[PDB]
Design a protein around this motif. Structure first.
Motif, PDB file in Angstrom:
ATOM      1  N   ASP A  14       0.717  -1.050  -0.178  1.00 48.86           N
ATOM      2  CA  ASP A  14       0.002   0.110  -0.568  1.00 48.86           C
ATOM      3  C   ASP A  14       0.844   1.265   0.228  1.00 48.86           C
ATOM      4  O   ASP A  14       2.011   0.908   0.556  1.00 48.86           O
ATOM      5  CB  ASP A  14      -1.012  -0.478   1.507  1.00 48.86           C
ATOM      6  N   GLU A  15       0.600   2.507  -0.372  1.00 50.39           N
ATOM      7  CA  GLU A  15       1.001   3.535  -0.467  1.00 50.39           C
ATOM      8  C   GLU A  15       2.023   3.734   0.373  1.00 50.39           C
ATOM      9  O   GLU A  15       2.593   4.972   0.998  1.00 50.39           O
ATOM     10  CB  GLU A  15       1.235   4.657  -1.341  1.00 50.39           C
ATOM     11  N   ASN A  16       0.448   3.787   1.882  1.00 50.06           N
ATOM     12  CA  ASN A  16       0.664   4.095   3.256  1.00 50.06           C
ATOM     13  C   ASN A  16       1.360   2.821   4.001  1.00 50.06           C
ATOM     14  O   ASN A  16       1.968   3.518   4.594  1.00 50.06           O
ATOM     15  CB  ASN A  16      -0.518   4.310   3.933  1.00 50.06           C
ATOM     16  N   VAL A  17       1.861   1.982   3.481  1.00 48.95           N
ATOM     17  CA  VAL A  17       2.383   0.826   4.344  1.00 48.95           C
ATOM     18  C   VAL A  17       4.254   1.733   3.761  1.00 48.95           C
ATOM     19  O   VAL A  17       4.274   1.221   2.786  1.00 48.95           O
ATOM     20  CB  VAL A  17       2.476  -0.854   4.121  1.00 48.95           C
ATOM     21  N   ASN A  18       4.749   2.136   4.720  1.00 44.92           N
ATOM     22  CA  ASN A  18       6.248   2.680   5.022  1.00 44.92           C
ATOM     23  C   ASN A  18       6.994   1.103   5.826  1.00 44.92           C
ATOM     24  O   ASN A  18       7.210   0.494   5.745  1.00 44.92           O
ATOM     25  CB  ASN A  18       6.052   3.988   5.312  1.00 44.92           C
ATOM     26  N   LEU A  73       8.339  -3.178  -2.901  1.00 46.12           N
ATOM     27  CA  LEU A  73       8.468  -3.718  -1.606  1.00 46.12           C
ATOM     28  C   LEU A  73       8.146  -1.756  -1.442  1.00 46.12           C
ATOM     29  O   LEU A  73       9.501  -0.815  -2.070  1.00 46.12           O
ATOM     30  CB  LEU A  73       9.964  -3.872  -1.802  1.00 46.12           C
ATOM     31  N   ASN A  74       7.097  -1.056  -0.696  1.00 49.82           N
ATOM     32  CA  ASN A  74       7.608   0.686  -0.725  1.00 49.82           C
ATOM     33  C   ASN A  74       9.037   0.647   0.600  1.00 49.82           C
ATOM     34  O   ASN A  74       8.834   0.301   1.429  1.00 49.82           O
ATOM     35  CB  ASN A  74       6.304   1.208  -0.350  1.00 49.82           C
ATOM     36  N   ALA A  75       9.664   2.211  -0.508  1.00 48.97           N
ATOM     37  CA  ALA A  75      10.891   2.585  -0.027  1.00 48.97           C
ATOM     38  C   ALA A  75      10.694   4.214   0.875  1.00 48.97           C
ATOM     39  O   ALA A  75      11.020   4.289   1.310  1.00 48.97           O
ATOM     40  CB  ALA A  75      12.350   2.945  -0.791  1.00 48.97           C
ATOM     41  N   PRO A 127      13.074  -7.248  -7.488  1.00 44.55           N
ATOM     42  CA  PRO A 127      13.547  -6.741  -8.698  1.00 44.55           C
ATOM     43  C   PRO A 127      13.064  -5.087  -8.713  1.00 44.55           C
ATOM     44  O   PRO A 127      13.260  -4.455  -9.525  1.00 44.55           O
ATOM     45  CB  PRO A 127      12.644  -7.615  -9.504  1.00 44.55           C
ATOM     46  N   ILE A 128      12.013  -5.235  -7.557  1.00 41.83           N
ATOM     47  CA  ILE A 128      11.047  -4.107  -7.801  1.00 41.83           C
ATOM     48  C   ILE A 128      11.714  -3.606  -6.874  1.00 41.83           C
ATOM     49  O   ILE A 128      10.576  -4.080  -5.152  1.00 41.83           O
ATOM     50  CB  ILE A 128       9.870  -3.877  -8.770  1.00 41.83           C
ATOM     51  N   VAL A 129      11.407  -1.800  -6.843  1.00 39.29           N
ATOM     52  CA  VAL A 129      11.376  -1.429  -4.886  1.00 39.29           C
ATOM     53  C   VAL A 129       9.712  -0.021  -6.013  1.00 39.29           C
ATOM     54  O   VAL A 129       9.349   0.103  -6.737  1.00 39.29           O
ATOM     55  CB  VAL A 129      11.790  -0.653  -4.517  1.00 39.29           C
ATOM     56  N   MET A 130       9.440   0.351  -4.312  1.00 39.78           N
ATOM     57  CA  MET A 130       8.390   1.642  -5.087  1.00 39.78           C
ATOM     58  C   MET A 130       8.141   2.711  -4.488  1.00 39.78           C
ATOM     59  O   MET A 130       9.281   3.123  -2.960  1.00 39.78           O
ATOM     60  CB  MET A 130       6.712   1.033  -4.243  1.00 39.78           C
ATOM     61  N   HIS A 131       7.222   3.764  -5.119  1.00 38.59           N
ATOM     62  CA  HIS A 131       7.922   5.119  -3.956  1.00 38.59           C
ATOM     63  C   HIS A 131       6.863   5.826  -4.148  1.00 38.59           C
ATOM     64  O   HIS A 131       6.042   6.297  -5.326  1.00 38.59           O
ATOM     65  CB  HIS A 131       8.894   6.029  -4.534  1.00 38.59           C
ATOM     66  N   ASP A 132       5.926   7.376  -3.433  1.00 31.71           N
ATOM     67  CA  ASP A 132       5.309   7.567  -3.628  1.00 31.71           C
ATOM     68  C   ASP A 132       5.810   9.119  -4.011  1.00 31.71           C
ATOM     69  O   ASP A 132       5.940   9.715  -2.874  1.00 31.71           O
ATOM     70  CB  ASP A 132       4.447   8.115  -2.022  1.00 31.71           C
ATOM     71  N   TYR A 133       6.184   9.455  -4.944  1.00 35.15           N
ATOM     72  CA  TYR A 133       6.881  10.577  -5.313  1.00 35.15           C
ATOM     73  C   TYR A 133       6.553  11.892  -5.028  1.00 35.15           C
ATOM     74  O   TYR A 133       7.732  12.262  -5.248  1.00 35.15           O
ATOM     75  CB  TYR A 133       7.437  10.956  -7.493  1.00 35.15           C
ATOM     76  N   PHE A 168       1.445  12.611   5.862  1.00 39.57           N
ATOM     77  CA  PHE A 168       0.154  13.807   3.865  1.00 39.57           C
ATOM     78  C   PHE A 168       0.498  12.573   3.848  1.00 39.57           C
ATOM     79  O   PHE A 168      -0.948  12.000   2.951  1.00 39.57           O
ATOM     80  CB  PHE A 168       1.374  14.436   3.448  1.00 39.57           C
ATOM     81  N   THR A 169       0.942  10.931   3.048  1.00 44.35           N
ATOM     82  CA  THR A 169      -0.239   9.772   2.694  1.00 44.35           C
ATOM     83  C   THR A 169      -0.813   9.132   3.140  1.00 44.35           C
ATOM     84  O   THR A 169      -2.003   8.722   1.967  1.00 44.35           O
ATOM     85  CB  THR A 169       1.375   9.317   2.044  1.00 44.35           C
ATOM     86  N   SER A 170      -0.943   9.373   4.076  1.00 40.50           N
ATOM     87  CA  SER A 170      -2.145   8.770   4.911  1.00 40.50           C
ATOM     88  C   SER A 170      -2.996   9.061   5.259  1.00 40.50           C
ATOM     89  O   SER A 170      -4.228   8.413   4.701  1.00 40.50           O
ATOM     90  CB  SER A 170      -2.320   8.143   6.518  1.00 40.50           C
ATOM     91  N   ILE A 171      -3.322  10.308   5.211  1.00 42.55           N
ATOM     92  CA  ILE A 171      -4.175  11.397   4.910  1.00 42.55           C
ATOM     93  C   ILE A 171      -5.147  12.050   4.100  1.00 42.55           C
ATOM     94  O   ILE A 171      -5.710  12.106   3.313  1.00 42.55           O
ATOM     95  CB  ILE A 171      -3.956  12.498   6.599  1.00 42.55           C
ATOM     96  N   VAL A 172      -4.247  12.835   3.665  1.00 46.14           N
ATOM     97  CA  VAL A 172      -4.088  13.263   1.586  1.00 46.14           C
ATOM     98  C   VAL A 172      -4.051  12.159   1.094  1.00 46.14           C
ATOM     99  O   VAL A 172      -4.255  13.076  -0.659  1.00 46.14           O
ATOM    100  CB  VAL A 172      -4.016  14.780   1.993  1.00 46.14           C
TER     101      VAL A 172
END
Lengths: 441, 123, 441, 441, 123, 133
Positions: free
Chosen positions: D177-181, D214-216, D237-243, F91-95
């Motif tokens: 998930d983009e939120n899982v860090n 894998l979110n980095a 093979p792949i990592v992820m980022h919330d740019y 920020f990612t979580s809320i917005v």
């Protein structure tokens, strides 16, 4: 006695302490409690700031029932007094000076309420209970450890041989003596290597993950890190540290190292009895245990309940809860002076050791439940047939107990029976039980 | 004085040192899960019955921990028999598989129980 | 009780311990002493080695005169048991487990004889007395330190202002509170910088070398080293550590760092009273002091003699000798149970603090002599005219005393007079003496 | 209004911008457009240089058809204004201040023409479409990803279990998930390890290469790099980022890291709707997409076309082209304001997600073609038989569609039929289709 | 509720989850390549039908991606039948081989298609 | 709308958000506020954990005075959702996703209550006012 403030309304961010005080004949309690707080926290420079903002304050006294000269003085310390993530600093500030205050005959710290706003500044355990079972793939029963004896004088190669024999028999962990660091009879790198060879062999043989607590305790932080580094290179699961002799500063460094490299950390409590035995003076083990959970460790030697009066078993269980759970409600019956909320900091597995025998299995299971490690010395090593059989004995004893429990049997009422039935089909167990069978049966 | 065999004593974690659970023993275990409100789930494996380290050897990394899920966790099941049934289902299908029953405690989000329910011939 | 060996002839390489034992009613002394030794050092694995080579042994008992239930049990431990250069390991091995032995009511470690073959495995003090006087160019008189109060809540800039005021008045050192590490009210780097500015200014003004003990105590070894690194970058002379709260592993790392970078190390003894106060249980401060000299520190807070009975003043002087001298002959009158040869490991300067006033100057000088640091809080900061004048007051008081002594005057007989004459020509001193002048004169 | 220069002849090196402007009542367009340009780029110091060389200039206005108060103002910025290889700087310069210009009711950046002379200063995607298919050995069909739900609260070990189940069923990727860090319920290193175990197992089982994004994403650049480092150690093979939440500076660092170490980079567009939703104010997603292709990412979440009007589907396809192709000719019908030449910078794979069901497979295939990843949450996880079967369902649905297409069938006319026939021979697919079958058939 | 088998479901990328292509299905695929102007090419392998990691384990490194070329890419071929023929040729020769058809788009210099045309017994 | 929980008693460790919501014609506020919270925080995997522990929840609605179609929806997020010391993650979580929820015409985050237990995970300013002067 601007330090005794019964009107005071503790804040959610306060650090609270429960001190067991034995005042010097003459000095009133209120004065007692105000002195604990006064140089437990705090001229012109004094007017350059606000006393009131950084002062510890005794907002409450209590007469200890039974005893003479004893109160429970409750002190509140502001969050700001403490360096974030530093158990060393929490300890210096609270217990640094007052134990030597003239006016006190004796003082004992019994509990501390660590607020969530301070707990969040600590990493806590490298992994904690849940993560460790998952990494080890072990669920549904207490974990079993074997103690390698003698404590000193064994060679690196003989160490590993006893390690392999003990593990291949059904135990999950082997443990380095807290005293084995690096010595003329056994240098550390040699031990690490041989133990690694031995735990892999036992793992391959049984099909179950094994670990050996490799002691990284050392003279300097650099040397301690250098030892954990080799354990990391070997790919093994767990390292060990003597947190009180090594010290909180080192322990916090090793716990970080472990988190960053995936190693479980087994903590040994050597030296604790020097500080926590005497009922009127010192620091109660429950405070030493919260500090460990804060500094970090995945396991912690907590003593044994074997032959302890119920009042004692209770105090023990109180600190077990404090080690493992997320929230512990205040409970003086069990010695829990403050409700402790851990805001999701991982829990630590209590390690029970000291004179445990298979016929003690039912009670241990019963008292501690699944989230514990039971450690045996004489029970394994001391078995008539050697380490492996010794190991089977404990492992079947434990499994008999879990099954029984799972079937609805009362471990407290049927302990002896459950053990006794298992002996019927485990020679190994049978051999371990003979002196006991004669006395009870 | 007996020698614990270094061969042919492969284990499977909890309860694997006891004599093979009987249909009733099995059932008793399932019921315990149920009494505590854990969600039973079957898992099976046909190739690697034991942990190994092929992909990586860093601390805590092992291959073979995960097995395949048999159907889905059995949410709301109330009859330990439903569970035993599935076991039966699983062995007919994969008589060569290792089958274990697991139980989830979602309140703590942990596996609170895990025991072998059936091993292939020779194990 | 193969552990009680009165026939035993200690070896030159043995580590010897003097334990003050209070046995449980019933258990004989010999059994007492054999139990201290037995799980203070030490199945089939047992036959893989030689017990006799690694066993602690009680080669001697002694009844404590006066008391009931107390003996002095003398234990010998083989050199091989100990990891070279590790105080952590010496402590784990000797005091790790026995304090919790059921059979003992209480146990107190009073002394240890560190053999020359073990002493030589330690670096000891980064510098030691002689090197420090030479680096500071200060000879012929005790060194003077000022304590900055309040203990918490001062800003980095106000810290340095009080530091500059106190130093420019004649004191050699200023000290960070043992509790000041890095906190919301004052982060460490800010303190280091401002204190550095303040000590250089006071140095430039007076023409005398100054130092401020910058506390590097921290949560982790990495952070502690990072703080000493900045002190090194600033070019300052001394850093500080709370060895018992930080722990021996960290302290040994910082003492090495100091040696390698030329920094003096001031040690604070926070938390000691938790372990060394109670006469029947714990570890006597003299053992904690030998351990510090081994781990390393150039200075160590040793308490005050101010208002201590002679028997106490004596015990104090015994541990002062153990800290400073090269060889200390056994002397029970002073609490020295073993002759201690330090084989040229540097000596540590004792730091006297706690309620010292100028009218105490004559006695302090007298008792400790030149190789000591006298630390004042209320005496400086508490002076009616501020820190500088406060500082002059102590510095002239000290100088009056040294001169007197040098002239052949008896400080013990003429203390009050010497002080009193100095007041005649030091307004500053005069102001500090007024409440005392009224009571004695 | 020396900033409105309709005579201006754009240069090949100019950066051009198309701003959708909604002027304040009263202010003419020309004045509008001249203000966008004036403090979107630009006293005596003014004469120390040449205005004319560094000024943005509005060389063209256009009335938006339909609407009231809206124009399309075209601004030209000189190459020299921009720091080479810095999307952060392109953004600061163009969109840093004008959106708050008093005189504008609202402003929306719709497009940017990145000249070849600026494009060549960027690395662009670590790998890009072609390299990724070749590294993964996947050709001839859109790639399939599975979304692990819930979004928060799953343990590291349960994460990996769902990851393994979903992959072994036929999907190419699983996504964090983009939120899982890293959080209390699941720390990152634990997730990485377990996911790695799970993706290798699914790879070994199916014979097809697998990946888990894998979110980095992290609090600091150092921590983000530390996470990609472990993914590199694991060989995945792949990592992820919330740019957008991590930011362009970090993203550019991670994209370089990926290039240097062979890792594919999956980009998530969290927070985009905060800036690109409102038609009168903000930055159109196509601008955010060009910026990502410049900063770097191998994949980018682009939304879904599922239930979008054709005019919308068109705007979407315009930005898909801009992401994947080498040269995109101006086309206002699709929202392409400038012809964009990418001078061989790799193309990015569009990632379609959000409510996709197997019966949407025909259209998705149709609209996006092979160079896309289709991501499913509820379609996999939500299947009546669990993740694997869920996975088969989508994989057969996709394969049915590709085959059909390959055979010359019209996916737009025969979607339902193709799906429906596949259900005949895929139970798994059949189970996924039952509620839909009832409504349409 | 059915359980997807963890064994014997080895795959080969595009179209391998559909029922084995029939001679006509195969032919249809070949024709598509031809319609778009891709160059068909056969590739076969007899030992490692699946990806593995022997030589290296860094990110993106896998062994077994490359297979052996059957003859040469079929430049200018115009009859999807020529292609099917070769397949036939290849299986007689290596009945134990895995055979796949690939298509090159040299305008983009990519492999735009790749599907299994024949698997040995038991796959 | 197990996400609208007016009974809810915020905890000292909660992160609270005040969203200015402009719902799509038709959708009630309560539904509005429950949607902000629902995919602003949160199948079978769902039963492997506890929803209730990690869900954002709208414990309060308020009509914006003056305006038409606007409320102030108050959302509570559990401390555990957030990575310590990471503004990126807060920020990612809320917005991260809700601003694009179909059902909202427009959304504006107006305020956040950062609890002391989360504030303490940040360094904050390198120096701050006092140190700088």
């Amino acid at each position: 006695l601007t330090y005794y403030t019964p009107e005071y309304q503790t804040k959610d961010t306060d650090i609270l302490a429960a001190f067991r005080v034995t005042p010097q004949p003459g000095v009133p309690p209120e004065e007692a409690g105000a002195a604990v707080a006064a140089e437990s926290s705090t001229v012109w420079t004094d007017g350059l700031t606000s006393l009131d903002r950084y002062k510890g304050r005794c907002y409450r006294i209590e007469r200890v029932v039974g005893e003479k000269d004893q109160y429970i003085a409750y002190v509140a310390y502001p969050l700001d007094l403490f360096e974030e993530g530093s158990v060393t600093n929490m300890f210096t500030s609270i217990v640094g000076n007052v134990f030597g205050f003239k006016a006190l005959r004796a003082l004992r710290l019994e509990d501390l309420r660590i607020p969530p706003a301070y707990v969040k500044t600590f990493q806590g355990p490298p992994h904690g209970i849940q993560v460790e079972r998952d990494k080890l793939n072990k669920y549904g029963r207490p974990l079993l450890g074997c103690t390698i004896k003698p404590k000193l004088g064994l060679s690196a190669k003989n160490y590993g041989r006893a390690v392999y024999e003990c593990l291949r028999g059904g135990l999950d962990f082997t443990k380095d003596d807290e005293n084995v660091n690096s010595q003329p009879f056994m240098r550390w790198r040699d031990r690490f290597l041989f133990c690694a060879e031995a735990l892999y062999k036992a793992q391959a043989e049984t099909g179950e993950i094994k670990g050996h607590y490799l002691n990284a305790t050392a003279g300097t932080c650099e040397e301690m890190i250098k030892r954990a580094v080799f354990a990391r290179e070997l790919g093994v699961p767990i390292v060990m540290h003597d947190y009180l002799t090594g010290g909180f500063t080192a322990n916090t460094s090793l716990a970080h190292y472990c988190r960053d490299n995936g190693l479980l950390l087994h903590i040994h409590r050597a030296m604790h009895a020097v500080i926590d035995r005497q009922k009127n003076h010192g620091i109660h083990f429950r405070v030493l245990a919260k500090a460990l959970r804060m500094s970090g460790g995945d396991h912690i030697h907590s003593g044994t309940v074997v032959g302890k009066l119920e009042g004692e078993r209770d105090i023990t269980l109180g600190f077990v809860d404090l080690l493992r759970d997320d929230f512990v409600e205040q409970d003086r019956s069990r010695g829990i002076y403050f409700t402790q909320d851990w805001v999701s900091l991982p829990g630590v597995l209590p390690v029970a050791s000291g004179g445990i025998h298979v016929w003690h299995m039912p009670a241990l299971t019963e008292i501690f439940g699944d989230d514990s490690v039971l450690q045996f010395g004489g029970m394994t090593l001391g078995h008539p047939w050697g380490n492996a059989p010794g190991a089977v004995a404990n492992r079947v004893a434990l499994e008999a107990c879990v099954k029984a429990r799972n079937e609805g049997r009362d471990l407290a009422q049927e302990g002896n029976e459950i053990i006794r039935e298992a002996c019927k089909w485990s020679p190994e167990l049978a051999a371990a039980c003979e002196v006991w069978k004669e006395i009870v049966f | 004085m007996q020698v614990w065999p270094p061969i042919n004593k492969k284990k499977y974690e909890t309860l694997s040192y006891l004599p093979d659970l009987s249909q009733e023993q099995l059932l008793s275990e399932v019921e315990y899960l149920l009494k505590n409100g854990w969600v039973p789930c079957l898992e099976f494996e046909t190739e690697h019955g034991f942990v190994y380290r092929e992909n990586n050897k860093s601390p805590g990394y092992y291959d073979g921990r995960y097995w395949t899920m048999w159907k889905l966790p059995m949410f709301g099941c109330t009859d330990a028999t439903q569970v035993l049934a599935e076991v039966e289902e699983a062995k007919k299908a994969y008589p060569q598989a290792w089958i274990r029953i697991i139980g989830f405690d979602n309140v703590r989000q942990v596996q609170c129980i895990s025991f072998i329910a059936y091993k292939p011939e020779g194990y």
